[PDB]
């Protein structure tokens, strides 16, 4: 893999938390990056006050998660599936209904695209190497088709080469030859090595406040966290209206601003508190 010192310029748009929309040139660049590379890094999107509260909440929840009889893991030890809280006090419009995120996902997936994931990944100290996989499959084997989903990844601490910054395979989102994927979405080793010779994977630091938007079919893997601190990620995924997903459980205390919006969420509104763990 190529280990970089910063998000590569070819994949990155630098914003501030004041930016509510991309100008036409910036949106065209964002869409060109997603089309060609399948991964877009947006730095400086979220105020530290939001990421601070989400980081704290997820670190506070981790003991209760680790105390379970069976700790749900992504492929290998140390990659813990952990939903962030869906308390009203930790559900932020600038996270769930981000105007720049939806400007991009509306342009790629259509005005009826909807968020259908509000989840997270806690990468623990001493975690193992995941196999290279896609989070969402191609819809038919051996066929080239456009995107139907965009993962929206929100690091809740600075991601470094040490603490488990994800490995990404740029341009891998369009690859769908026969016999490429097993039943868990892991890439066959022969296809990995063919691809590596043409377009090797990258790992790079991602500062907290960043949002990563990627094609749900992009090849990637979680990697070892060699630091002494858990590395929390908040994960959302926008889908075309026609892709079948179970709804996100949200408290009805956010129904007023979630259900109103032209930034669609596939949501089931629950009376009282939701048990996110």
- Using CB under 8 A, list all residues that contact a copy of itself: 139-140, 143, 145-146, 148, 240-245
Across the strands, what pairs with 43? 14
Comparing CB distances to a copy of itself, the nearer of 246 and 260 is 246
Q: Does 153 engage in binding with Ni ion (CB under 5 A)?
A: no
CA–CA gap between residue 207 and residue 134 (Å, rounded):
23
Interface map 107-146 toward Ni ion (x if CB under 5 A)? ----------------------------x-----------
Comparing CB distances to a copy of itself, the nearer of 18 and 244 is 244
CB of 158 to Ni ion, least distance (A): 20
Give 76's DSSP letter: S
- The three-class DSSP label of residue 174 is helix
Q: Does 215 engage in binding with Ni ion (CB under 5 A)?
A: no
Comparing CB distances to Ni ion, the nearer of 237 and 253 is 237
CA–CA gap between residue 236 and residue 248 (Å, rounded):
10
The pair of structure tokens assigned to 66 is: 């680790």
CA–CA gap between residue 92 and residue 23 (Å, rounded):
24
The item of a copy of itself, Ni ion, none sharing an interface with residue 135, based on CB under 5 to 8 Å by kind, is: Ni ion
Helices 24-37 + 99-109 axis angle, to 10: 60
Q: Does 83 engage in binding with Ni ion (CB under 5 A)?
A: no
- Tell me the longest C-alpha to C-alpha distance in the chain: 53
Comparing CB distances to a copy of itself, the nearer of 102 and 243 is 243
Binding-site ranges for Ni ion (CB under 5 A): 135
């Amino acid at each position: 893999h190529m280990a970089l010192a910063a998000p590569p310029g070819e994949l990155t748009l630098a914003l501030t938390p004041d930016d509510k929309t991309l100008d036409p040139a910036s949106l065209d660049r964002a869409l060109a990056i997603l089309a060609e590379h399948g991964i877009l890094v947006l730095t400086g999107m979220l105020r530290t006050r939001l990421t601070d509260q989400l980081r704290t909440a997820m670190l506070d929840d981790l003991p209760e998660v680790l105390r379970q009889q069976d700790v749900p893991t992504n492929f290998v030890p140390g990659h813990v599936q952990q939903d962030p809280p869906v308390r009203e006090s930790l559900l932020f419009p600038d996270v769930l209904l981000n105007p720049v995120v939806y400007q991009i996902t509306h342009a790629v997936l259509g005005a009826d695209a909807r968020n259908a994931v509000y989840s997270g990944n806690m990468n623990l100290p001493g975690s193992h190497e995941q196999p290279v996989h896609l989070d969402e499959p191609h819809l038919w084997p051996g066929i080239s088709h456009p995107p139907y989903c965009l993962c929206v990844d929100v690091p809740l601490i600075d991601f470094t080469l040490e603490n488990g910054s994800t490995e990404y395979w740029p341009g891998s989102h369009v690859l769908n030859p026969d016999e490429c994927y097993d039943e868990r979405g892991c890439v066959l080793p022969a296809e990995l090595e063919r691809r590596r010779a043409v377009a090797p994977p990258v790992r790079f630091p991602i500062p907290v406040g960043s949002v990563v938007i990627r094609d749900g079919r992009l090849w990637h893997r979680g990697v070892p966290n060699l630091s002494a601190a858990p590395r929390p990620l908040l994960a959302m995924t926008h889908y075309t209206e026609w892709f079948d997903m179970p709804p996100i459980q949200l408290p009805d205390t956010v129904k007023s601003w979630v259900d109103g919006s032209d930034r669609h969420t596939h949501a089931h509104f629950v009376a009282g508190d939701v048990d996110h763990l």
